[PDB]
């Protein structure tokens, strides 16, 4: 019982280390700071003739 209790302590650290490394790789794929810095702005426009569409 003492042995099983002692081993669980290091088994905590191993699980934490594995979680940390995997999540570091997953989140390195997420949007970078330069990308997030360009996600909000405003633009003004004018008028077009009826029956038409401008993109």
């Amino acid at each position: 019982a003492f042995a099983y209790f002692v081993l669980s302590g290091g088994r905590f650290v191993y699980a934490s280390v594995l979680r940390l490394l995997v999540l570091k790789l997953i989140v390195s794929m997420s949007a970078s700071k330069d990308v997030l810095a360009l996600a909000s702005l405003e633009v003004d426009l004018g008028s077009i003739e009826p029956g038409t569409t401008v993109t």
Binding site: I26, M29, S30, A31, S32, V35, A39
Partner: peptide, 17 residues
């Protein structure tokens, strides 16, 4: 979708990955 893109659209990050 936004994780696979690396952003809010298909852009340079998508191409590099």
């Amino acid at each position: 979708v936004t994780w696979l893109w690396g952003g809010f659209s298909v852009d340079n990050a998508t191409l590099n990955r």
